[PDB]
Structure formats: structure tokens, C-alpha cells
């Protein structure tokens, strides 16, 4: 291959794909922040966003291919 | 692994996962919540709040992992 | 544990749990408000309330754990 | 060929076109943006922005050639 | 299956299907609000709402699967 | 095909058509709605409500395709 | 054609015309959208929203030709 | 003539006049724009903005000459 | 045709036409009715309703066509 | 012609006009809360409110054009 | 003439004068809003709403001069 | 004169004075958002809004000259 | 005289004063509204609203000084 | 003097006090407004509103000395 | 003494102080928000603002020594 | 004394203490609203509510030291 | 000690604990509006704000030790 | 020890610790603030952010060890 | 070794890693602009943070090796 940085997937991958901690920890922030913000607002919209961000993120990720 | 970040979920999980106490004072406002409007306004609503936010942090946390 | 604020349990229910003075004021309150607006417009709605509240935060206390 | 310089797109293409492993770290640096912003301020257009860009780049690539 | 969220649904039949402790409850409120109201009123509407709502729920359940 | 999202139907069709949990709970929370609407002001409007709901959710859902 | 970017159409209207599932996701979540919503309020307009965005969509896309 | 330029109109017409495909897409995302914030929101400027964009690029082009 | 909603006259017609279900309850309640009030009051009205409404409903949705 | 939306009467005719599904849905609205109403209240009222609206809509959509 | 912007009447008149489609389709959703609050709440000022619109539009326009 | 901008009136009187397309449009924009505003809220203030608009420009324009 | 905005009550008096078209509507309405409440009600306070208001017009009109 | 701004009354007081065009028109505003909404609900707080509004702006204007 | 500045207060108290243009510019324009504020609203808290106006610069100005 | 605002209550005793000329004006009010509600409704509490206000005040002034 | 801004206790105790001129007008501002929003609206909160603000100060101050 | 910086505590500890006057200050910022927003909204939510404030420095103080 | 700056780490580590004055320092400066923010605008996003950077500091520090 003549791509010189092609390497980079084994730990980009590892870091920020679908898999990754951190991927699981913005996933685990909604959970909480629905929760939060039902509890102050009781805006149903806080709870909907979980399944929206995990719709959205199994999507993009499967896209982006990591 | 590849992950780089990895070893963060000890203290991810401790401190915003379901058992945490992060996570537990979240659901003690609802229930103080859930007292202190219905007092105030005698709207149902915020006495079923309670079992909602339960129920959601419970499917949430599932989903994510943690 | 990783639970890197486990240690404010120990106000948290102080404070907030069911025995607290928080919880006791707002349960108060309810009995005065019971009686006023009783007073005002004796409808029975408002008599009723004292108990439900009372057994709103029994349980809520209990599933919440303070 | 007179282009002194013509051999230089073996790697470039490599490293840079539509394939590459930079160009894949974008795409998925914007699934991970629109998921943590969208997760802060629900605010809708941090999702379509995956769309936009995928569509931005697909276009772009083929019209410079790589 | 495809669906991101299946799982909840143990959770949410358990609290807020037919059986559960909630909808239990509201049932049970209906049959102290028929007795206080109908002692108050004596209009024979507030006895017959026990029916209806046990008929309402039997049928609303079925119908919404749980 | 041209859509560079296509995709992303398997699991929105999943979680969010007529067949996928999250309806399934909208529904379900309006027959739990109606009861405890009704129990409180027998209002009928509260009953009609399911059979409403049911009814917009069928044709809005085949007109969506979902 | 002078039109140097014309080569974009094949993938904008893919991802964004009427038929693209961009476009069937926005009428999905009406769909949902009208359910919630009159569930909790039983107002009207919420499903009469359904027909507009129908409706809009229909008329927007004709005229912008995608 | 002596405007040194004069040429570019061939491409700057075809790409950014009337009939483009940038202004095209312009116009397209108003209809999806208006869409989604509709459905969001329900305020109804968000559907008159497509008749007053369409309206606008119009009346400029002419005036422009592209 | 144009009617883009057209298509919900299936299940409109099945569940709030002359025929449906909802419709024959509310039939059905009328004969409940008249017998409790007349027994209550002894007051005439209360039987009349009952062709009353069977008489309005076969008017009413012979001009609605349903 | 210059009304660069014209062409939206096709479907805003087809959906919304005096013989489209919408409008025959809140006419057969009327039989039904008609018949629910009187049989509820015996208020002659809500029988008249079915020729009352048969006449409005006529007279509206006449002069509406639609 | 000094006005830059003359040319924009023969648009403006047509897409947003009294004769255009936009201004038919307000007085359209009168004609259905009337009838379905009308429908819902036997306030007469629905259907009064409709005579003052088109009297209110009919003297703007003529003001205006579209 | 000394004033070295002096001949810049015949057009900015020519699109913006009283008499300009640009302010018949403003007007213009009003009976419309009149009739929409009151069709939607049947709030009054949308109607006098309409008289205001007209009288304050005429006595704005006057002051200004123009 | 000091006051810039003088000219105005040229127009302001024309069309805001007691003899203009617009307070003349304002007194019209109530005719109209008067006739209708009462027919519906049969409550006599209907009635006394058009001397009401025309009384309070011609006060509050001459305080003003239009 | 050192007041460095002192000539300014002479076109505040003229345009902004109490026997100002500007002031005279807000008090009949509220002539209007009165009629109109006591037209519209009955309510006697917006007849009271004359005098209240006549009586401040009189305080007002006498303390502030314009 | 030392003050480089101390010159300074006699213009400074002359255009700032209590006394001053600008002073007696701002109260004056309470006077007026206040009569437009409740002519709009009927909130009573438009006019108390003016005593808290007048109270609070009385106070300020004592206390700054202007 | 440390209180760097203590100067200020001499005015504010002055304008918002008991014998104020705010606080008798917030007293005639009642007198004027007991006197207007009554005749209207003939609801007693609209007199009473005169000497529960001077009670209220005279108390609550006592405690406030003002 | 080692807090350098020690010193700063004399005068933020003198101006903001509960003894100061800035707290006692706080509290006289609640009878203040406690008799106004009672003599508006009849709502007994407003009377009982008083006692509760009262409350609450004294409990805030002595906790935080001002 | 190697920190280089070590000393600073004493004056850290002294000046932004729990027991600092600039801790306490914020603190009583609470009690002031609560007043004051309560007395004007009369949302409870500003009376319990005192005991928040109060209990989340307590916990935060003590894992910050200062 | 051959790492000509190795000796820096007894310092380096000393002042900026985990336990030293530095990071405590920081640490600390959250607890107090929690506090004050969260006083100023109850927005629960600025007690959110504390544990936040605690979170990151420990996983950060732990990857670095400080
Ligand atoms: C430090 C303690 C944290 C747990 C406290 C929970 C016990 C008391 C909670 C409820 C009392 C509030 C009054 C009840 C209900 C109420 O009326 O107030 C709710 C109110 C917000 O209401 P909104 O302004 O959205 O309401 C608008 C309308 O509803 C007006 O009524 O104030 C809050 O935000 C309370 C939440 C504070 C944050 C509570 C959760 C804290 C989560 C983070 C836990 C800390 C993690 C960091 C630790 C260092
Ligand atoms: C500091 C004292 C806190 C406890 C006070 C309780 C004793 C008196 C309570 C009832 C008297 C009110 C009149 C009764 C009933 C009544 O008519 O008023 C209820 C009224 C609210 O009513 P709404 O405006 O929702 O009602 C709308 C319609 O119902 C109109 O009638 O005012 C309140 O919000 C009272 C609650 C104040 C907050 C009370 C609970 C405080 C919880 C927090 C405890 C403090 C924690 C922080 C401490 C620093
Ligand atoms: C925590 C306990 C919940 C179950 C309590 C049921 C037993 C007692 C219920 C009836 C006594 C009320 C007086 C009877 C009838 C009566 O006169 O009061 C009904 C009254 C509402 O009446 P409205 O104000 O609509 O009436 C207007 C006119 O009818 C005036 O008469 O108050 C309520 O809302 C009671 C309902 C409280 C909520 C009850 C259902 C709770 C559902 C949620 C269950 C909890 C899930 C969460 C758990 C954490
Ligand atoms: C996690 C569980 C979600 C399903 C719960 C459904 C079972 C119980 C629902 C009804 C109990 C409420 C009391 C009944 C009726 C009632 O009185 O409360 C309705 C009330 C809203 O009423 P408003 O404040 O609009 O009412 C104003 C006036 O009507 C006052 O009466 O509260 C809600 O918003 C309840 C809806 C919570 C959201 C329910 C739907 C959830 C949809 C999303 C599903 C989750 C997707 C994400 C999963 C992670
Ligand atoms: C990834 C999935 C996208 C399609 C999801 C649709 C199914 C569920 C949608 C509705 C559930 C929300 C609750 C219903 C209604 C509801 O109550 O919430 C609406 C709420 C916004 O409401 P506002 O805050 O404007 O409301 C203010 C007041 O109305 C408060 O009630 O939240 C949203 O923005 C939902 C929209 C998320 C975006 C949906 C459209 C996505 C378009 C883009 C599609 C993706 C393209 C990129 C793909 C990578
Ligand atoms: C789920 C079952 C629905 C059908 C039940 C019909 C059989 C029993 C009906 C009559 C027994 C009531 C006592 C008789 C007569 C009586 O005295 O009570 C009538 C009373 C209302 O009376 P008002 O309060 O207007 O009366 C004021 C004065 O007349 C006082 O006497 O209560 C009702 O609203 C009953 C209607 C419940 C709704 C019945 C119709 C339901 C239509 C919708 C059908 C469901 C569609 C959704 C399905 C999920
Ligand atoms: C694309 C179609 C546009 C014409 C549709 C008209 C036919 C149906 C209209 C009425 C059905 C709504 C339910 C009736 C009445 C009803 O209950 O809903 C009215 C409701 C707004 O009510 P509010 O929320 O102000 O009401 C508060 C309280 O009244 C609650 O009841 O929803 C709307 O805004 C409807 C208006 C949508 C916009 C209609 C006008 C569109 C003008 C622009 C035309 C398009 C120009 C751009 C074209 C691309
Ligand atoms: C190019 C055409 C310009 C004239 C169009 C006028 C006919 C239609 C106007 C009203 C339809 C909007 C819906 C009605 C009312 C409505 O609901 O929408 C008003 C809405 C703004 O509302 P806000 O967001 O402030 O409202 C907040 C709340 O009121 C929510 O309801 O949208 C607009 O800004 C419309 C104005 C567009 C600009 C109109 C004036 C254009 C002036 C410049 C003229 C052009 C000079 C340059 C020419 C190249
Ligand atoms: C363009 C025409 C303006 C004049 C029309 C007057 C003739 C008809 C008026 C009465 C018919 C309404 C039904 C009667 C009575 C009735 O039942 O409806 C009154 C109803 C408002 O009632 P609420 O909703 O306050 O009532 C609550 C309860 O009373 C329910 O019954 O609707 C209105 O607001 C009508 C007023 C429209 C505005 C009328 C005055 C217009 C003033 C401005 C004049 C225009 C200046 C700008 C010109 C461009
Ligand atoms: C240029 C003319 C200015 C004077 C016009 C006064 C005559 C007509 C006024 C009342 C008709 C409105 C309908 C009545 C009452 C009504 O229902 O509408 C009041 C309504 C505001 O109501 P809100 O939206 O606060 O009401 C919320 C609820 O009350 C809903 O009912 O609209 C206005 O703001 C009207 C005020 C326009 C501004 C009037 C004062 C102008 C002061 C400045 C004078 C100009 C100085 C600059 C000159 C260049
Ligand atoms: C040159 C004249 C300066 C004095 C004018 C005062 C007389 C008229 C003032 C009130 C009429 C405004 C409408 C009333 C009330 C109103 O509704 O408008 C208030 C409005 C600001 O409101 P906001 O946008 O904050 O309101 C948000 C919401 O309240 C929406 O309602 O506009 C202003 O800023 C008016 C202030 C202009 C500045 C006035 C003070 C000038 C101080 C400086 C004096 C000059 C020193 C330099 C001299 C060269
Ligand atoms: C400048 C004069 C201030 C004192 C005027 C008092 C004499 C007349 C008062 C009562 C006549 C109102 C009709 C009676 C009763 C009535 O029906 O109207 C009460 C009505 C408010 O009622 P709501 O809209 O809350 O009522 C809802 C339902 O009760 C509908 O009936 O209007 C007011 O707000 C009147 C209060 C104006 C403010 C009065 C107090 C002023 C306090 C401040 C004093 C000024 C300090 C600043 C000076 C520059
Ligand atoms: C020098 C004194 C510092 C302590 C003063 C505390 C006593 C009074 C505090 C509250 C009175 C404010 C009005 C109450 C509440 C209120 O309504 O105002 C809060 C307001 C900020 O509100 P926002 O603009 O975020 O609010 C947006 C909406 O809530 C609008 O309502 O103003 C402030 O920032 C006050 C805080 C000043 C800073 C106070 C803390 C000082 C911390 C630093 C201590 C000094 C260290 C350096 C010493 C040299």
C-alpha cells in the first residue's frame, strides 16, 4: 500500500470506534443525563435522546467503519 | 487491546454506573421531587415520575454497560 | 472501591434520606396545606393528600435506599 | 510526461484521497462529535452534520480525482 | 433483531403491565374514590367507574400487549 | 444506489416502526394514562384517548412505511 | 456544462431528496412525535402535524426537484 | 472589451447562478430544514421560510443576472 | 388521487364508523343509563334518550358516510 | 403565472379540501361525541352541534375554494 | 425609476398577494380549524374565527395593494 | 453643496422610502402574519398589529423624509 | 414646539380616536358579540356590555383627547 | 453649569413628557385596549386599567418633573 | 493634594450625579416603561418599578456622593 | 457600624414602611376591589379579604420593623 | 491565619448577614408583595410567603453564620 | 519531597478552603439569593438550592482535602 | 540509559503529577467555581463538573504515569 499512516487504524480503532471506551462512555453520559434532566424538567425529550444517541451512533460507527 | 483509554472503566464504572452513589442521588431527588410537587400542586404526575425515572435508568444503564 | 465519591453518602442521607429534617419539612408542610385548603373550599382532595404523600415517600425512600 | 512531480501521486493518493486512513479518522471523528455534542445539547443538527460531511467528502473526492 | 432497545421490555411489563404493582394500584384508588365520593354525592356515577375502569384497563392491556 | 445513509433502516425501522418497543411503550402509557386520568375527573375524553392514539399510530406508521 | 460541481446530484439526491432515508426518518419521527406528544397533552394540533409534514414535505421537494 | 476577467462568467454562471447545482441544494435543505424544525418545534415559520426562500434567491438572481 | 391520507379510511371506518366496536358501546351505554336513571328518578327522559341516540347515530353517520 | 408555489394545490386540495379524508374524519368526529355527549348529559346541545358543523364546513370550504 | 428592487413584485404578488396560493391555504386551515375546536369545544368564537379572517385578509391585501 | 454623498438619495429614497418595493413588502408581511398568527392563536393583537405597522411607518417615514 | 414626534397625531387621531374605523369596529363587535352571547346564555350581563362599552369609550376618549 | 448634557431637555421634555405626543398616545392605547378586551372577556380589571394607567403616568411624569 | 485627576467631579458630578440631564433622563424613561409595560400587560410589578427606580438612585447617588 | 448601606432606611422606611403612601394606596385598593367584586358576584370572601389585607400587613410590617 | 481576605468578614457581615439594611429589605419587600399579589388575586400563598421567607432566612443565616 | 510548590498550601488551605472567608461568603451568597428569588417567583426551587449548595461544598470541600 | 533528562522526574512528578500541590490546587478551584456558579445560576451542569474532573484527572494521571 502507499498509504503511509495506514498503521494508525490498529489504535484509532482501539481509542474511538464503536467498541471503545470512550465510545461507551458518551453512551453512559446520556444515561445519566436523561435521567438528570427528566428529574428537574420532566421534558419526556431526556429520555428519548438515549435511544436516539444509541440509533445514532450504531449507525454512524457501522458507516465510518470502526 | 489497542484501546489506549481502557483502563479508565474502573472509575467510570465506580463512579457513573448504576450502583454509584452519583447515580443513587440522582434517583433520591426524584423521590424528594416527586414530594415536594405533588405537595405543592397535587398533579399525579410527579408521583409517577418516581417509578419512571427508575425504570429508565434501569433499561439505560443495561444498554450501556455499566 | 472506584467509586471515587463514595464518601458523600454520609450527607447525602444525612440531609436528603427519610429521616432527614428536609424530608420531615416537606411532609409538615403537607399537613398545613391540607388544612388550609380544606379550609378554603372543602374539597375532601385535600385531606387525602397527607396520606398519599406520606405513603409516596415511604416507598420512594425505600427503593431509593436513604 | 513533462511533470517533474507526476510520481508524487502514488502516496498522496495513498495517504490522502477518498480511501485513506486520514480521511476515514475524519469521517469518524464527526460520529463521535455529533454524538457527545448532540449528547450535551440535543440539539438535532450534531446528527445531520454526519450526513453532511460523508455527503461533503464523497462529492469532493471524486471531483479532485482521489 | 434490529432493535436497539428490545431488552426493556422486562422491566417495562414487569412495572407497568396488567399484573404490575402500579397499575394494581390504580385500580385499588379507584374503589376508595368511588366509596368517598359516592358518600359525599350520592351520585351513583362514582360507582360505576370501577367498572368501567377494570373494563378499560382489561381491554387497554390486551390490546397494548402487556 | 446514491444514498450514502441507506443503511441506517435496519435499526431505525427496528427501534422506532410500528412493531418496536419504544412504540409499544408509548402505547402502553397511554392505557396506563387513561386509567389514572379517569380515575381522577371521569372525563371520558380520557378513555377515547386510547383508541385514538391507536388508531393515529396504525395509519401514520403505514403512511411513514415503518 | 460549465457547471463544474454538477456531478454532486447523483449523491445529494440519493441522501437527501424526498424518497432518501434521511427524508423517511424526518416523517418517522413525526409519527412518533404526534403519539407522545398527545398521549401527554391530548391536544390536537399534535396529530394534526402528521398530515402537515406530509404534506410540506410533498410540496418542498417538488418544488426543489429532489 | 476591456475587462480582463470576462471569461469567468462561463463557470461562475454555471456553478453559482439560478440554476446551479449549489443553488439547487440551497433550496433543497430548506425542505428539509423546514422539516425537521417543524416537526421539532411546531412553530409554523418554519414552513414559510421554504416560500421565502425560493422567493428570494428568485428575485436576487434576477437582479444579479445569474 | 392527491389525498396523500386517503389510505386511513380502512381502519377510521372499522373503528369509529357506524359499525365499530367504540360505536356499539356507546349504544350499549345508553341502554345501561336509561335503566339506572329511570330506576333512580322515574323520570321519562331517561328512556326516550335511548331511540334519541340510536335515532341521531344512524342519521349522523349516514351523512358522515361512515 | 408569477405564484411560484402554485403548484402545492394539487395536494393541499387532495388532503385538506371539503371531500378529503381529514375533513371527513372530524366530521364523523361529530357523530361520535355527539352521541357520547347527549348520551352522557342529555343536553340537546350536542345533537345540534352535527348540523351546526355539517353547515360551517360546507360554507367554509365554498368560500375557501377548497 | 430609482428603485433597485422594482422587479420583485411580479414574485411577491404572486406567491404572497391575496389571490396566491400561501394566502388560500391560511384561509383553508381556518375553515378546518373552525370546524375541529368547534368540534371539540362548542365555543361559537371557532366559527366566528372564520368570517374575520377572511374580512381581516380581504382589507389587508386591499391596504397593502396585493 | 459639501455634502460629497448628497447624490446617493435618488436611490436610497427609490428602495427605501415609503413608496419602495422593499417597504410594500414589509407591509405585505404583515397581513400575512396577521392572518396566520390569529388563525393559529386567535389572539386579537395579531390583527391590530396590521393598523399599527401601517401607521407607524407612515409617521417614521415622514420624520425620515423619505 | 420641542416635541419631535408632533406630527403624528395626524394619523394617530384619523385612525385610533373615537370616530375612526377601527374604534367603530371595537363598538360594532360588541353588538354582534352581545346578540350572540345572549341568544346562547340567556344571561343578561351580555346585554349590558354594548352600554358599558360605548359609555367607557366616550370617557376614556374624551380623557385621552381623540 | 457643568452639566455638559443640560440642553437636552429642551427635546426630551418636548418628546418624552407628560404633555408629549409619545405619552398622549400610550394613554390611548389604553382607551383602546380597554374596549377591546372588556369587549372580548367581560373582565372589569381592563375598564379599571384607564384610570389606573391615566393616574400613574400623572404621578410619574409630576415626580420625574417632565 | 495628590489626586492627579481631583478636577475631574465638576463636570462629572454636573452630567452624572443626581441631578444631572442624564440622571433625570432615566427616571423619566421608567415613567414612560412603566405606562407602556402595564398598557401591554396589566403586571402590576411595571409600576412598582418606578418607586424601586426612584428609591434605589436616591440611595446610590447618597452612598457615590454625586 | 460595618452595614456600608445602612443609610438607605431612611428612605425606604419612608416609601415602603406601613405608614407609606405605597403601602396605604396597596390598602384602598382592597376597598375598591371588595366593593367592584362584590357587586359583581356577591361572593363574600371579596369582603372579608379587606380586613384579612390590614391584618396581613399590619402584622407582617411589625415583624419587618418597617 | 493564613486567609488573607480574613479582614473582609466586617463588612460582609456588616451589609449581608441577617441584621443588615440589604436582608431587612428583602424581608419588608415580601409583605410589601405578599399584600399586593393577595389584594389581585385572593391566592392564600401569597400571605403565607411571608412566614416562610421569614423562616427561611433565619435558618439560611444561622447556618451560614451570618 | 520534590514539589517545588509545596508551601503554597498554607495560604490556599487558608484562603479557599472550607473554613475560608471566601467559602463562607459564597455560602451566605445562598441565603441572600434564596431570599430574594423566592420572594419574587415564589418557586420553591430557590429554597432547597441552599441546603444543595451547602451539602455539595461540604462533600466537595472534603474530597478536594481543603 | 541514555535518556540525558531522565533526572527531571523527581521534580517534574513531584510539582505536577496526581498528589502534588498543583493538581490539589486545581481540584480545589472546582469545588469553589462549582459553588459559586451553581449559586448564581442553578444550573446543575457546574456540580456535574466536580466529579467530573476528578474522574479525568485520576484516569489521566494514571495513563500518564504521574
Ligand atoms: C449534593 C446533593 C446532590 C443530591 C441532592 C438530592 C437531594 C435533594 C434533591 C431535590 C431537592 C430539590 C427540590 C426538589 C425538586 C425541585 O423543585 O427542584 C428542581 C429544580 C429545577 O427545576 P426547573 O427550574 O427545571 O423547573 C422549572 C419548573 O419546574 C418550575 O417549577 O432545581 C433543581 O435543579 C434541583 C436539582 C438539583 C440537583 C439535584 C441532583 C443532583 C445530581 C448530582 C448529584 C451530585 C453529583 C456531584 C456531587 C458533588
Ligand atoms: C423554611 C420552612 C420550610 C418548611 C415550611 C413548611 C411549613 C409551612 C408550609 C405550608 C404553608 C404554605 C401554605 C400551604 C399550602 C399552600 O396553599 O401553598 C402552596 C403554594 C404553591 O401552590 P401553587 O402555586 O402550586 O398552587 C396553584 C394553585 O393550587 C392555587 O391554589 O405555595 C408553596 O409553594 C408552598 C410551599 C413552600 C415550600 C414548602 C416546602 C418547603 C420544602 C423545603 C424545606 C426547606 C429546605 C430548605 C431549608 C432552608
Ligand atoms: C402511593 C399510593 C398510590 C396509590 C394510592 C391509592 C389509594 C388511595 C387513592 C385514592 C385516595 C384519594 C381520594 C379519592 C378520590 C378523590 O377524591 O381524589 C381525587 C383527586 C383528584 O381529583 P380532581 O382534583 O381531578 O377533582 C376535581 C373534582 O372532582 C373535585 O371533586 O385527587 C387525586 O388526584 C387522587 C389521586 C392521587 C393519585 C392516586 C393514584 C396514584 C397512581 C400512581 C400510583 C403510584 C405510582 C408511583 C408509586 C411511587
Ligand atoms: C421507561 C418507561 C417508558 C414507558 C413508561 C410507560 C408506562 C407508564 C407511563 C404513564 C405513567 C404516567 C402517568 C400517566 C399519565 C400522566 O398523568 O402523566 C402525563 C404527564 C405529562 O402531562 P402534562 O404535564 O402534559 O399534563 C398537563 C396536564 O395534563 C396536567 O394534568 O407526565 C408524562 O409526561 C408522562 C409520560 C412520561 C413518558 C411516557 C412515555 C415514554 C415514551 C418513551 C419510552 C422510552 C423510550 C426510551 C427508553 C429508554
Ligand atoms: C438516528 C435516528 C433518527 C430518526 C429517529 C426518529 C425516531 C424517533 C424520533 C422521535 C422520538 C423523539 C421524541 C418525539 C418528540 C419529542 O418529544 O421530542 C422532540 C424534542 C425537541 O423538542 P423541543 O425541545 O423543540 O420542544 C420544546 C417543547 O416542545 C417541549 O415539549 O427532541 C428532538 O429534537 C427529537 C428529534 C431528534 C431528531 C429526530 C429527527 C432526526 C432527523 C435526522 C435523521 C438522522 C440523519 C442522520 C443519521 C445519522
Ligand atoms: C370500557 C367500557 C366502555 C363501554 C361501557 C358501557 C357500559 C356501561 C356504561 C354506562 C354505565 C354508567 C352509568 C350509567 C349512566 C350514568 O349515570 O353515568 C353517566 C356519568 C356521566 O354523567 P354526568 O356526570 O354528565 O351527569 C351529571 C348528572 O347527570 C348527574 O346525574 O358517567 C359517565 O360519564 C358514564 C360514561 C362512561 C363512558 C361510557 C361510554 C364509553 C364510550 C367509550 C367506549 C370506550 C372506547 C375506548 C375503549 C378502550
Ligand atoms: C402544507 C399545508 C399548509 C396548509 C395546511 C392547511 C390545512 C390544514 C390546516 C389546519 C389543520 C391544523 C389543525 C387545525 C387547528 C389546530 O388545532 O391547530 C392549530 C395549532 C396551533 O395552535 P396553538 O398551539 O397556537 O394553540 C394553543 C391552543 O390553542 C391549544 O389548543 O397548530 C398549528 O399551528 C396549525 C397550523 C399549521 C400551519 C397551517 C397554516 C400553514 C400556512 C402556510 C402554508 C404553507 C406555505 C408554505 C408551503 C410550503
Ligand atoms: C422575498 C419576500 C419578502 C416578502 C415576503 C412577505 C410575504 C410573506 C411574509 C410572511 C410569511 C411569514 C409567516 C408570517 C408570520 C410568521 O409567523 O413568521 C414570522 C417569523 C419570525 O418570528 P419570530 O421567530 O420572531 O417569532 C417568535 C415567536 O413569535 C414564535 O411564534 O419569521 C419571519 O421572520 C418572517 C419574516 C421573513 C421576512 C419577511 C419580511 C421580508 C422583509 C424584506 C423584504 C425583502 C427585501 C429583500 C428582497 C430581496
Ligand atoms: C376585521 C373585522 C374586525 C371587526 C369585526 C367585528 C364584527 C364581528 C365581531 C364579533 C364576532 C365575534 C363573535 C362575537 C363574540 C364572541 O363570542 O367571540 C369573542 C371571542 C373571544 O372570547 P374569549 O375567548 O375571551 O372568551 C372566553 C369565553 O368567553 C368563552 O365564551 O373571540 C374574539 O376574540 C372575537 C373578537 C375578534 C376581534 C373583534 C374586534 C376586532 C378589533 C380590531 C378591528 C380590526 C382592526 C384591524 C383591521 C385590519
Ligand atoms: C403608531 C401608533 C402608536 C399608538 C397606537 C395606539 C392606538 C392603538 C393601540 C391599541 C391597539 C392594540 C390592541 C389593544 C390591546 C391589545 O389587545 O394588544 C396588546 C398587545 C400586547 O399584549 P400582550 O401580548 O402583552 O398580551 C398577552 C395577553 O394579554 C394576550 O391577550 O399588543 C400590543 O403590544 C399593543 C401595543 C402596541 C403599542 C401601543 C403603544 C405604542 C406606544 C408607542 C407610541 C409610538 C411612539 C413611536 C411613534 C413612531
Ligand atoms: C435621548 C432620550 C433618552 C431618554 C429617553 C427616555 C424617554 C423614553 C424612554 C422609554 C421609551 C422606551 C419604551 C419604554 C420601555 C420599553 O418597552 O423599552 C425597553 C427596551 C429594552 O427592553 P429589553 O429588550 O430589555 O426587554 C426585554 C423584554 O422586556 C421584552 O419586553 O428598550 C430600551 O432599551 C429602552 C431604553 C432606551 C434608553 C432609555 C434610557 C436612555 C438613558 C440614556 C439617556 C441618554 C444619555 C445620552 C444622551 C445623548
Ligand atoms: C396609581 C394608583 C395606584 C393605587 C390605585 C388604587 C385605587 C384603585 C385600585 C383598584 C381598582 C382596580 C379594580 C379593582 C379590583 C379588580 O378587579 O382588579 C384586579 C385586577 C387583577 O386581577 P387578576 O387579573 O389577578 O384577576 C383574575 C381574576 O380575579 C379575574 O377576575 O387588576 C389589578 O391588578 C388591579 C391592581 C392594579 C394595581 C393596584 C395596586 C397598585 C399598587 C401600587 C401603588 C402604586 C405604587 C407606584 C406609584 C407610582
Ligand atoms: C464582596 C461581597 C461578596 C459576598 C457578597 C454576598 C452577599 C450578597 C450576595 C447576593 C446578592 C445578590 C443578589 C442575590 C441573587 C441574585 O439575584 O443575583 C445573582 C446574579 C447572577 O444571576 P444570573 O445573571 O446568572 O441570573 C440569570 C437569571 O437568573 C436572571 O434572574 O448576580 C450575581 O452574580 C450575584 C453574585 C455576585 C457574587 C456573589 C458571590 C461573591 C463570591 C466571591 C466572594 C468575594 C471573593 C473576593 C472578595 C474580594
Request: without cysteine.
Amino acid at each position: 500500500a502507499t498509504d503511509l499512516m495506514k498503521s494508525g487504524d490498529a489504535t484509532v480503532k482501539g481509542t474511538f470506534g464503536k467498541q471503545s471506551s470512550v465510545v461507551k462512555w458518551v453512551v453512559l453520559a446520556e444515561v445519566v443525563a436523561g435521567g438528570i434532566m427528566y428529574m428537574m424538567t420532566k421534558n419526556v425529550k431526556f429520555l428519548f435522546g438515549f435511544a436516539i444517541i444509541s440509533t445514532f451512533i450504531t449507525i454512524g460507527m457501522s458507516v465510518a467503519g470502526y
